[PDB]
């Protein structure tokens, strides 16, 4: 009754659409050659995510910041060593079911 | 052709636990349409006076008896509000759906004709001012569909010691 | 150099495989009839997730707890009203790339 | 058939900035295989004594000169450790791969023959005791592949004011 509607509403609140820290696979994020390793392979950024209460509505970003991160890229064969690369990743700052 | 009641008003203010008895009398054999049952004696007493009469009476009247009362043989309608203190609010409960037609009405029925009352949910509170969203004592509040789509459930909030009805919401 | 390896290592640390709060769509989680709405439609639980440094290795649970949650289920047509249902959801408590 | 040096030892302890000069003398015309260049005079001086001689000399010797020294015409090998204080550690740097063969060796070369030294990374520190993982002054430490698969990078840690080499790791 009371307490159950309370908790249920809390579950809704807790499960609502919003930006969340996720691990993005860099290679898969820019779609590079199948001969590259990234180190680290993934980066933690915030992206819009969660569940909408309709199906035809999908959680999308309405505003995005950009984060500079630096990591290393190994190519094959080992012609050269790991080179430093600077990359900008999306950091979603607001979301809406659209 | 149209019949008439013993009380020519479209809105009666009654208190709970008060005995209510009205005579609908007009021409043809008549029959009341008072919502439900029971504990209320239904006796069709003729009177002549220039018409056939029919009286409706009820001794024990509380909240679960407030509603509309029609005496159809050109029908004759009259609404009656029965004021209760324990349960001023009547829920569905848990019955609410909607179709995209810009018209989404909430069925949260009010015991008292004049109240300052607001509808609240998970998505803040929704104040009625009359242009986009409008309150109506007859049954509840009226809201446009695509704006309330954002909310998942709804619950009417009052100003008294507070009382909260609780229907839900499913969009189409 | 120094500070860059430092940060990179921090990115790795931050992006490592572990249990994370996610929103699970209940209907889709048990695979119910395409005529049911769940309220709320989704629940927040922790599931093993993140990125492995190999491809053939995939983040899986090595131990799971179970959480009782109660919510409402609407069926169609509106023959009856929403009924209370108790459901157990997996709460992953440890993970390994397998 | 096999030649011989002016110093019959498989391991020489030298300090940095110290001038080093050894005579490999044995039979046929010979040639040293000292790692790289330069600032070290290469002169093949005969001596007869019962063989043709060849001397290798070097005035400025630091860390980037420590290594193995062979005089092949049955070869004649001798390793020389040149102790430095500023840069006791030599990295690849950033060169490390592996194939699944249970043998994964780390190339972090040590200036000093006897050290207590441990390899650390993101996944705690890895202590060498000799059965599963084993340390070797000649070049570095030996670890089985499927256990180090869990780690992403590696860096040798010492006990002195600390020094950290830094290769990486990519599995196959
Ligand atoms: C990256 O996105 C996150 C969003 O998760 C930002 O963190 C905060 O997000 C909340 C949303 O609830 C905002 O109200 C805050 O203003 C954000 N910053 C903080 C910590 O106060 C984060 O700022 C974003 N990073 C950037 C600058 O790109
Ligand atoms: C559900 O899973 C989470 C895991 O995210 C549990 O929360 C804590 O997880 C950390 C892992 O870093 C453990 O060390 C803690 O022991 C966990 N509990 C806390 C808050 O101390 C959570 O306990 C799980 N819920 C249950 C009991 O099923
Ligand atoms: C999200 O929306 C903003 C709106 O300006 C856009 O700039 C950004 O590129 C979007 N994020 C995506 C799709 O990567
Ligand atoms: C008839 O109606 C009047 C109100 O107009 C009411 O006061 C009276 O009690 C009714 N008579 C009965 C009980 O039939
Ligand atoms: C209203 O309806 C129910 C029907 O069983 C009844 O039990 C309840 O007591 C009624 N409310 C009153 C008279 O206060
Ligand atoms: C209800 O609110 C309205 C707002 O204008 C106010 O005028 C009225 O007096 C209120 N009713 C009360 C508190 O009696
Ligand atoms: C995760 O692993 C545990 C091991 O006991 C198992 O009981 C649990 O069912 C697994 N979680 C899944 C696959 O839902
Ligand atoms: C020959 O070797 C000895 C060590 O055995 C060394 O002390 C000496 O300097 C060398 N002679 C030279 C410089 O040719
Ligand atoms: C070692 O090698 C590099 C090669 O350019 C040289 O510049 C450096 O000074 C050397 N280290 C010494 C002699 O301390
Ligand atoms: C290095 O560690 C070993 C551990 O047994 C110890 O015996 C030895 O004395 C240490 N070397 C030092 C501190 O001189």
XYZ file of C-alpha atoms and ligand atoms in Angstrom:
708
model
C 0.000 0.000 0.000
C 1.632 3.186 1.321
C 5.178 1.939 1.954
C 5.088 -0.167 -1.201
C 4.092 2.752 -3.444
C 6.862 4.610 -1.613
C 9.539 2.070 -2.431
C 8.265 1.518 -5.974
C 8.460 5.274 -6.595
C 11.973 5.154 -5.153
C 12.882 2.388 -7.615
C 11.551 4.532 -10.446
C 13.547 7.505 -9.167
C 16.687 5.353 -8.913
C 16.235 3.828 -12.378
C 15.453 7.035 -14.279
C 17.202 8.320 -17.425
C 20.456 10.185 -16.709
C 24.204 10.390 -17.492
C 26.212 7.498 -16.082
C 29.890 6.624 -15.940
C 30.560 3.900 -18.483
C 33.627 2.295 -20.016
C 34.004 3.133 -23.687
C 36.239 0.923 -25.824
C 38.354 3.460 -27.686
C 39.127 1.376 -30.779
C 35.450 0.485 -31.095
C 34.593 4.135 -30.422
C 36.451 5.418 -33.466
C 36.402 2.180 -35.447
C 40.108 1.765 -36.113
C 42.087 -0.917 -37.929
C 41.834 -4.472 -36.601
C 45.588 -4.316 -36.010
C 45.719 -1.702 -33.254
C 45.810 -2.147 -29.498
C 44.890 0.765 -27.261
C 46.445 1.098 -23.811
C 44.355 1.344 -21.833
C 41.760 -0.162 -24.214
C 38.892 1.671 -22.554
C 38.190 5.041 -20.921
C 35.643 6.013 -18.238
C 33.308 8.790 -19.356
C 29.737 9.801 -18.640
C 27.133 9.006 -21.274
C 23.352 9.391 -21.240
C 21.751 6.129 -20.208
C 18.846 4.489 -18.403
C 15.295 3.370 -19.074
C 12.333 5.247 -20.551
C 8.718 4.383 -19.658
C 7.737 4.209 -23.316
C 9.392 2.135 -26.058
C 9.308 4.642 -28.931
C 11.218 7.099 -26.754
C 14.977 6.606 -26.468
C 17.444 8.268 -24.103
C 19.594 10.799 -26.041
C 21.966 13.673 -25.165
C 20.712 17.225 -25.219
C 24.092 18.722 -24.327
C 27.648 17.375 -24.416
C 30.965 18.469 -22.899
C 34.308 17.205 -24.216
C 37.150 15.722 -22.171
C 40.765 15.620 -23.306
C 42.472 12.354 -22.384
C 45.924 11.090 -23.349
C 46.786 7.437 -23.896
C 49.033 5.083 -25.850
C 48.492 3.295 -29.171
C 50.319 0.123 -30.223
C 50.434 -0.763 -33.929
C 51.639 -4.007 -35.577
C 54.260 -4.982 -36.511
C 56.375 -3.473 -33.731
C 58.004 -1.068 -36.187
C 57.917 1.780 -33.685
C 57.108 2.000 -29.990
C 53.862 3.166 -28.325
C 53.195 6.794 -29.249
C 51.306 9.301 -27.082
C 47.946 10.369 -28.486
C 45.524 13.034 -27.289
C 41.838 12.275 -27.822
C 38.589 14.058 -26.966
C 35.716 11.999 -25.560
C 32.077 12.978 -25.184
C 30.891 13.666 -21.639
C 27.106 13.900 -21.799
C 25.741 16.590 -19.486
C 21.969 16.370 -20.038
C 19.524 13.802 -21.422
C 15.957 13.418 -22.674
C 13.795 10.559 -23.936
C 13.330 11.386 -27.629
C -42.205 15.757 -21.352
C -39.280 16.351 -18.955
C -39.749 15.292 -15.274
C -38.771 17.319 -12.185
C -37.438 16.683 -8.659
C -38.501 17.807 -5.174
C -35.358 19.943 -5.160
C -34.686 22.107 -8.219
C -30.907 22.435 -7.862
C -27.990 21.095 -9.911
C -25.744 20.922 -6.851
C -26.744 19.994 -3.302
C -24.484 20.336 -0.263
C -25.104 17.517 2.213
C -23.164 16.277 5.250
C -22.365 12.599 5.851
C -24.546 10.424 8.067
C -27.458 12.694 7.185
C -30.722 11.159 5.986
C -31.606 12.282 2.460
C -34.990 11.880 0.759
C -36.185 13.541 -2.460
C -39.368 13.214 -4.547
C -38.972 13.038 -8.326
C -42.485 13.586 -9.679
C -43.369 14.146 -13.330
C -45.975 12.587 -15.625
C -45.102 9.029 -16.712
C -44.023 6.114 -14.482
C -40.516 7.058 -13.331
C -37.405 5.410 -11.892
C -34.349 6.852 -10.135
C -30.747 6.195 -11.160
C -29.008 6.631 -7.801
C -25.515 5.030 -7.919
C -25.549 1.519 -6.492
C -26.876 -0.140 -3.352
C -27.996 -0.419 -0.689
C -29.463 0.392 2.743
C -31.689 2.859 0.888
C -35.443 2.132 0.574
C -36.745 2.411 -2.993
C -40.479 3.130 -2.928
C -42.525 4.620 -5.761
C -45.236 6.625 -4.012
C -47.859 8.275 -6.225
C -49.214 11.707 -5.278
C -51.312 13.068 -8.176
C -51.410 16.710 -7.003
C -50.745 16.668 -11.921
C -48.228 13.791 -12.173
C -47.117 10.378 -10.909
C -44.573 10.649 -8.096
C -41.589 8.580 -6.967
C -39.520 9.098 -3.818
C -35.935 8.067 -3.101
C -34.738 7.860 0.502
C -31.512 6.935 2.297
C -30.719 6.786 6.015
C -27.025 5.874 6.157
C -25.131 8.119 3.773
C -21.359 8.478 3.904
C -18.542 9.000 1.401
C -19.159 5.906 -0.730
C -22.595 7.337 -1.557
C -21.689 10.803 -2.940
C -22.491 11.202 -6.627
C -24.875 12.135 -9.421
C -28.608 11.491 -9.180
C -30.844 11.403 -12.248
C -34.570 10.702 -12.608
C -35.195 9.749 -16.236
C -38.553 8.665 -17.635
C -35.648 15.415 -21.361
C -33.954 13.761 -18.384
C -33.711 15.415 -14.962
C -30.240 15.546 -13.408
C -29.049 16.720 -9.990
C -25.631 16.305 -8.364
C -25.224 15.801 -4.608
C -21.997 16.254 -2.622
C -21.892 14.327 0.665
C -19.221 15.789 2.951
C -17.183 13.264 4.927
C -14.291 13.865 7.328
C -12.566 10.478 7.567
C -12.297 9.701 3.852
C -12.656 12.982 1.908
C -11.044 11.380 -1.134
C -12.258 8.628 -3.438
C -9.725 6.853 -5.648
C -10.315 4.523 -8.573
C -8.115 2.989 -7.040
C -5.376 1.979 -9.497
C -7.314 2.551 -12.723
C -5.872 4.932 -15.313
C -5.062 4.796 -19.030
C -5.007 7.316 -21.892
C -5.232 7.790 -25.665
C -3.417 10.494 -27.641
C -6.186 13.047 -28.161
C -4.846 16.036 -26.187
C -7.447 15.196 -23.527
C -6.225 13.473 -20.375
C -8.664 13.660 -17.473
C -7.838 12.472 -13.957
C -10.575 10.614 -11.999
C -9.863 11.742 -8.437
C -13.290 12.643 -7.005
C -13.738 15.392 -4.410
C -16.067 15.351 -1.393
C -16.128 19.158 -1.063
C -17.210 21.608 -3.782
C -14.658 24.321 -2.998
C -11.132 23.298 -2.235
C -7.675 24.591 -3.014
C -6.106 21.326 -4.294
C -3.089 20.436 -6.432
C -2.051 17.272 -8.270
C 1.425 15.926 -7.460
C 3.576 12.977 -8.546
C 7.177 11.908 -9.097
C 7.630 14.908 -11.383
C 6.941 17.784 -8.966
C 3.490 19.299 -8.397
C 1.090 20.512 -11.111
C -0.842 23.717 -10.279
C -4.228 24.355 -11.972
C -4.848 27.918 -13.217
C -7.370 27.262 -15.987
C -5.788 27.693 -19.429
C -3.603 24.644 -20.087
C -4.475 22.586 -17.025
C -7.840 23.063 -15.322
C -9.452 21.809 -12.112
C -13.095 20.708 -11.965
C -14.985 19.851 -8.776
C -17.377 17.612 -10.707
C -14.830 14.811 -11.116
C -11.197 15.929 -11.168
C -8.537 17.831 -13.092
C -7.923 18.137 -16.840
C -4.426 17.984 -18.337
C -3.039 17.754 -21.885
C -1.568 14.344 -22.775
C 1.906 15.065 -24.186
C 2.951 17.082 -21.133
C 1.854 14.490 -18.569
C 3.500 11.760 -20.639
C 6.661 12.564 -18.651
C 5.025 11.409 -15.399
C 4.506 7.739 -14.504
C 1.951 7.885 -11.685
C -0.343 10.564 -10.253
C -1.808 11.416 -6.848
C -4.095 14.287 -5.846
C -2.777 16.381 -2.933
C -4.964 18.508 -0.637
C -4.809 21.189 2.069
C -6.227 20.161 5.452
C -3.800 16.099 8.327
C -3.442 15.419 4.602
C -5.124 13.014 2.175
C -3.678 11.448 -0.977
C -5.573 9.496 -3.624
C -3.447 7.314 -5.907
C -4.201 6.263 -9.493
C -1.404 5.417 -11.954
C -0.578 6.165 -15.606
C -0.043 4.208 -18.833
C 0.333 6.006 -22.170
C -0.692 4.944 -25.678
C 56.139 10.538 -19.114
C 55.722 10.105 -15.346
C 52.462 11.998 -14.785
C 51.024 10.644 -18.025
C 51.701 7.002 -17.118
C 50.170 7.949 -13.766
C 46.943 9.244 -15.249
C 46.749 6.472 -17.849
C 47.070 3.885 -15.068
C 44.342 5.781 -13.226
C 42.109 5.548 -16.308
C 42.735 1.810 -16.424
C 41.930 1.534 -12.717
C 38.734 3.558 -13.209
C 37.629 1.557 -16.261
C 38.286 -1.933 -14.882
C 35.817 -4.848 -14.748
C 33.449 -4.706 -11.756
C 29.780 -4.733 -10.642
C 27.887 -1.580 -11.570
C 24.403 -0.266 -10.900
C 22.368 -0.635 -14.072
C 18.710 -0.367 -15.012
C 17.226 -3.713 -15.974
C 14.000 -3.746 -17.984
C 11.890 -6.270 -16.099
C 9.689 -7.421 -18.986
C 12.772 -7.875 -21.154
C 14.494 -9.566 -18.208
C 11.962 -12.377 -17.987
C 10.685 -12.141 -21.554
C 6.977 -11.730 -20.896
C 4.010 -11.288 -23.220
C 4.029 -8.259 -25.520
C 0.832 -7.154 -23.781
C 2.188 -6.400 -20.311
C 3.350 -3.120 -18.827
C 5.542 -3.151 -15.740
C 5.404 -0.276 -13.262
C 8.064 0.769 -12.851
C 9.308 -0.783 -16.124
C 12.872 -1.040 -14.871
C 14.739 -1.774 -11.631
C 18.206 -0.661 -10.461
C 20.480 -3.577 -9.600
C 24.196 -4.259 -9.708
C 25.495 -6.420 -12.536
C 29.042 -7.334 -13.550
C 30.248 -4.967 -16.234
C 33.232 -3.148 -17.708
C 36.030 -3.732 -20.186
C 38.578 -6.546 -20.441
C 42.039 -6.033 -21.983
C 41.608 -9.055 -24.233
C 38.726 -9.762 -26.630
C 38.265 -13.501 -26.034
C 37.758 -12.781 -22.339
C 34.324 -11.553 -21.265
C 33.221 -10.126 -17.921
C 31.052 -12.701 -16.065
C 29.741 -13.172 -12.499
C 31.551 -15.466 -10.122
C 29.059 -14.951 -7.295
C 25.514 -13.579 -7.158
C 23.225 -12.347 -4.377
C 19.456 -12.047 -4.841
C 17.293 -9.024 -4.039
C 13.563 -9.183 -3.387
C 11.701 -6.267 -4.957
C 7.957 -5.664 -5.213
C 6.276 -3.868 -8.100
C 3.076 -3.672 -10.133
C 2.052 -5.426 -13.358
C -0.599 -4.123 -15.761
C -2.186 -6.570 -18.215
C -4.494 -5.823 -21.183
C -7.411 -5.518 -21.487
C -8.073 -3.739 -18.189
C -9.974 -6.757 -16.868
C -8.463 -6.381 -13.410
C -6.372 -3.698 -11.739
C -2.588 -3.646 -11.152
C -1.610 -6.568 -8.925
C 1.367 -6.613 -6.540
C 4.150 -8.987 -7.550
C 7.301 -10.000 -5.695
C 10.342 -10.704 -7.865
C 13.961 -11.650 -7.173
C 16.693 -9.907 -9.164
C 20.345 -10.857 -9.485
C 22.818 -8.632 -7.647
C 26.271 -9.617 -8.875
C 28.855 -9.548 -6.088
C 32.070 -10.588 -7.866
C 33.326 -10.711 -11.457
C 36.075 -12.181 -13.631
C 37.060 -11.988 -17.295
C 36.337 -15.506 -18.576
C 90.233 -23.586 -31.709
C 88.518 -21.440 -29.042
C 90.048 -17.979 -28.283
C 90.634 -16.464 -24.825
C 90.541 -13.022 -23.164
C 92.962 -11.067 -20.961
C 90.499 -11.664 -18.129
C 89.216 -15.213 -17.630
C 85.946 -14.388 -15.858
C 82.293 -14.714 -16.886
C 81.287 -11.733 -14.756
C 83.281 -8.553 -14.144
C 82.354 -5.878 -11.606
C 83.259 -2.416 -12.893
C 82.320 1.093 -11.737
C 81.097 3.810 -14.113
C 83.461 6.400 -15.561
C 86.249 3.851 -15.198
C 88.519 3.133 -18.161
C 88.295 -0.499 -19.272
C 90.713 -2.283 -21.612
C 90.986 -6.033 -22.254
C 93.098 -8.131 -24.648
C 91.364 -10.984 -26.469
C 94.206 -13.053 -27.925
C 93.830 -16.465 -29.548
C 95.105 -17.922 -32.826
C 93.239 -16.611 -35.893
C 92.482 -12.966 -36.773
C 89.860 -11.906 -34.220
C 87.207 -9.223 -33.747
C 85.308 -8.046 -30.663
C 81.521 -7.806 -30.408
C 81.202 -5.027 -27.825
C 77.655 -3.546 -27.929
C 77.520 -0.420 -30.068
C 79.528 2.782 -30.355
C 81.443 4.860 -29.692
C 84.156 6.871 -27.908
C 86.010 3.561 -27.613
C 89.195 3.002 -29.676
C 89.178 -0.265 -31.631
C 92.757 -1.336 -32.345
C 93.913 -4.842 -33.239
C 97.397 -5.094 -31.750
C 99.331 -8.305 -32.422
C 101.564 -9.749 -29.694
C 102.719 -13.245 -30.741
C 103.922 -14.385 -27.291
C 101.564 -18.176 -29.459
C 98.620 -16.268 -30.995
C 97.397 -13.109 -32.729
C 96.116 -10.520 -30.257
C 93.387 -7.871 -30.314
C 92.707 -5.245 -27.651
C 89.482 -3.399 -26.862
C 89.622 -0.164 -24.869
C 87.127 2.416 -23.604
C 87.689 5.633 -21.652
C 84.183 6.971 -21.007
C 82.035 4.151 -19.685
C 78.697 4.776 -17.998
C 75.332 3.013 -17.788
C 74.550 2.938 -21.514
C 77.677 0.807 -21.981
C 77.022 -2.091 -19.548
C 76.527 -5.426 -21.289
C 77.899 -8.650 -22.730
C 81.278 -8.808 -24.451
C 82.223 -11.646 -26.792
C 85.371 -12.251 -28.846
C 84.477 -14.740 -31.579
C 86.848 -15.890 -34.311
C 84.163 -22.143 -29.666
C 83.349 -18.496 -28.958
C 84.655 -16.642 -25.898
C 82.052 -14.806 -23.816
C 82.397 -12.503 -20.806
C 79.764 -10.310 -19.145
C 80.624 -6.935 -17.596
C 78.460 -4.981 -15.134
C 79.159 -1.235 -15.059
C 77.803 0.281 -11.840
C 76.153 3.685 -12.191
C 74.471 5.824 -9.529
C 72.328 8.264 -11.517
C 70.617 5.777 -13.834
C 70.886 2.292 -12.268
C 68.027 1.069 -14.448
C 67.795 0.548 -18.193
C 64.355 0.266 -19.784
C 63.413 -0.872 -23.269
C 61.648 1.647 -22.982
C 58.077 0.774 -24.005
C 58.819 -2.507 -25.787
C 57.038 -5.656 -24.615
C 54.955 -8.404 -26.228
C 54.374 -12.115 -25.567
C 53.334 -15.450 -27.084
C 51.491 -18.218 -25.226
C 54.332 -20.611 -24.410
C 54.376 -20.464 -20.589
C 57.538 -18.354 -20.901
C 57.206 -14.617 -20.332
C 60.501 -12.864 -19.648
C 60.762 -9.215 -18.614
C 63.605 -7.118 -20.129
C 64.430 -4.764 -17.256
C 68.246 -4.783 -17.058
C 70.102 -4.345 -13.763
C 73.294 -2.349 -13.167
C 74.196 -4.252 -9.978
C 74.693 -8.026 -9.706
C 73.154 -8.446 -6.250
C 70.001 -6.579 -5.454
C 66.808 -7.274 -3.569
C 64.293 -6.150 -6.248
C 60.604 -6.782 -6.924
C 58.397 -6.265 -9.978
C 55.244 -4.188 -9.437
C 52.325 -2.977 -11.561
C 48.629 -2.123 -11.410
C 47.980 -5.568 -9.945
C 50.017 -5.391 -6.719
C 53.668 -6.454 -6.453
C 55.137 -9.776 -7.637
C 57.813 -11.294 -5.351
C 60.436 -13.661 -6.853
C 61.245 -16.796 -4.816
C 62.448 -19.127 -7.569
C 59.864 -21.828 -8.322
C 57.047 -20.210 -10.309
C 58.535 -16.758 -10.793
C 62.309 -16.307 -10.781
C 64.681 -13.332 -10.812
C 67.857 -13.289 -12.912
C 70.552 -10.609 -12.732
C 71.629 -11.347 -16.304
C 68.616 -9.601 -17.845
C 65.487 -9.580 -15.688
C 62.735 -11.690 -14.148
C 60.904 -14.751 -15.491
C 57.144 -15.194 -15.096
C 54.574 -17.642 -16.499
C 52.259 -16.143 -19.141
C 48.718 -17.017 -18.013
C 49.228 -15.512 -14.555
C 50.644 -12.199 -15.786
C 47.881 -11.996 -18.389
C 45.845 -10.253 -15.667
C 48.273 -7.306 -15.606
C 48.362 -4.609 -18.301
C 51.726 -2.921 -17.731
C 54.847 -3.730 -15.706
C 57.556 -1.763 -13.901
C 60.554 -3.023 -11.927
C 60.781 -1.622 -8.378
C 64.002 -1.404 -6.341
C 65.332 -0.723 -2.833
C 67.631 2.299 -2.530
C 65.649 7.369 -3.543
C 63.873 4.837 -5.755
C 64.093 3.931 -9.448
C 61.352 2.567 -11.709
C 61.776 1.188 -15.220
C 58.604 1.000 -17.316
C 57.823 -1.423 -20.153
C 54.230 -2.381 -21.027
C 52.324 -5.574 -21.894
C 50.318 -6.951 -24.828
C 49.136 -10.572 -24.861
C 48.629 -12.979 -27.765
C 30.704 14.910 -17.199
O 29.380 14.538 -16.880
C 29.027 14.528 -15.509
C 27.551 14.153 -15.457
O 27.386 12.924 -14.789
C 29.293 15.866 -14.808
O 29.187 15.675 -13.406
C 28.143 16.439 -12.746
O 26.856 16.087 -13.215
C 25.797 16.658 -12.482
C 24.476 16.088 -12.983
O 23.745 15.561 -11.898
C 25.834 18.172 -12.636
O 24.804 18.749 -11.863
C 27.181 18.712 -12.180
O 27.269 20.083 -12.499
C 28.348 17.956 -12.816
N 29.603 18.335 -12.182
C 29.824 18.281 -10.865
C 30.663 17.140 -10.368
O 29.397 19.114 -10.065
C 30.693 16.381 -15.141
O 30.836 17.722 -14.727
C 30.999 16.296 -16.633
N 32.387 16.641 -16.868
C 32.719 17.596 -17.731
C 33.074 18.935 -17.154
O 32.741 17.412 -18.945
C 24.800 -5.812 -4.577
O 26.053 -5.600 -5.190
C 26.859 -4.562 -4.662
C 28.157 -4.591 -5.461
O 28.310 -3.392 -6.182
C 27.121 -4.707 -3.158
O 27.677 -3.495 -2.673
C 29.012 -3.599 -2.112
O 29.957 -4.022 -3.076
C 31.296 -3.961 -2.640
C 32.218 -4.292 -3.806
O 33.171 -3.264 -3.965
C 31.498 -4.934 -1.488
O 32.824 -4.839 -1.018
C 30.529 -4.616 -0.358
O 30.598 -5.632 0.618
C 29.091 -4.475 -0.858
N 28.239 -3.940 0.196
C 28.493 -2.812 0.866
C 27.682 -1.606 0.487
O 29.327 -2.724 1.767
C 25.819 -4.997 -2.410
O 26.092 -5.398 -1.085
C 24.995 -6.087 -3.089
N 23.707 -6.205 -2.434
C 23.281 -7.374 -1.966
C 23.417 -7.601 -0.490
O 22.795 -8.239 -2.691
C 24.452 15.484 -28.053
O 23.811 16.718 -28.332
C 24.631 17.861 -28.563
C 23.727 19.052 -28.878
O 24.513 20.167 -29.213
C 25.598 17.610 -29.724
O 26.436 18.712 -29.878
C 26.416 16.364 -29.426
O 27.232 16.064 -30.559
C 25.516 15.180 -29.125
N 26.325 14.035 -28.735
C 26.647 13.086 -29.616
C 25.561 12.647 -30.544
O 27.768 12.600 -29.685
C -38.970 16.841 -0.828
O -37.919 17.725 -1.168
C -37.631 18.693 -0.181
C -36.561 19.648 -0.697
O -37.060 20.353 -1.811
C -37.169 18.003 1.094
O -36.900 18.970 2.085
C -38.246 17.051 1.590
O -37.746 16.316 2.685
C -38.688 16.100 0.482
N -39.868 15.371 0.909
C -39.883 14.046 1.034
C -39.092 13.461 2.167
O -40.511 13.310 0.275
C -18.602 1.855 1.633
O -18.547 0.621 0.929
C -18.116 -0.582 1.542
C -18.683 -1.749 0.744
O -18.476 -2.951 1.451
C -18.559 -0.701 2.991
O -18.030 -1.870 3.574
C -18.055 0.514 3.737
O -18.321 0.370 5.114
C -18.754 1.734 3.157
N -18.277 2.940 3.805
C -18.896 3.456 4.869
C -20.359 3.145 5.035
O -18.321 4.169 5.691
C -7.754 29.262 -1.581
O -6.779 29.932 -2.376
C -7.214 31.125 -3.006
C -6.095 31.671 -3.888
O -6.525 32.891 -4.452
C -7.635 32.140 -1.958
O -8.169 33.282 -2.593
C -8.696 31.556 -1.039
O -8.952 32.434 0.017
C -8.195 30.218 -0.474
N -9.210 29.622 0.389
C -9.116 29.698 1.713
C -7.738 29.569 2.301
O -10.085 29.856 2.456
C 26.790 -16.036 -11.558
O 27.514 -17.081 -10.930
C 26.901 -17.757 -9.835
C 27.845 -18.856 -9.352
O 27.220 -19.606 -8.341
C 25.557 -18.360 -10.253
O 24.946 -18.947 -9.147
C 24.674 -17.259 -10.819
O 23.469 -17.841 -11.316
C 25.378 -16.520 -11.941
N 24.557 -15.403 -12.385
C 23.768 -15.510 -13.456
C 24.349 -16.214 -14.640
O 22.624 -15.076 -13.482
C 94.745 -7.127 -19.808
O 93.833 -7.699 -18.891
C 94.103 -7.400 -17.537
C 93.124 -8.150 -16.642
O 93.322 -9.537 -16.790
C 94.000 -5.899 -17.313
O 94.290 -5.600 -15.966
C 94.979 -5.168 -18.219
O 94.768 -3.779 -18.103
C 94.809 -5.603 -19.672
N 95.901 -5.074 -20.468
C 95.705 -4.226 -21.475
C 95.270 -2.835 -21.118
O 95.870 -4.538 -22.653
C 74.101 7.233 -23.426
O 73.565 7.378 -24.734
C 73.157 8.633 -25.251
C 73.170 8.546 -26.771
O 73.001 9.833 -27.322
C 74.053 9.778 -24.805
O 73.551 11.008 -25.275
C 74.088 9.785 -23.294
O 74.791 10.919 -22.840
C 74.756 8.494 -22.842
N 74.781 8.423 -21.394
C 75.822 8.865 -20.688
C 77.161 8.894 -21.375
O 75.724 9.230 -19.517
C 68.282 -8.785 0.838
O 67.237 -9.615 1.337
C 67.640 -10.879 1.836
C 66.408 -11.681 2.245
O 66.836 -12.906 2.799
C 68.591 -10.694 3.005
O 69.074 -11.952 3.425
C 69.776 -9.830 2.605
O 70.552 -9.530 3.726
C 69.261 -8.524 1.981
N 70.381 -7.689 1.559
C 70.778 -6.652 2.292
C 69.701 -5.844 2.959
O 71.959 -6.332 2.433
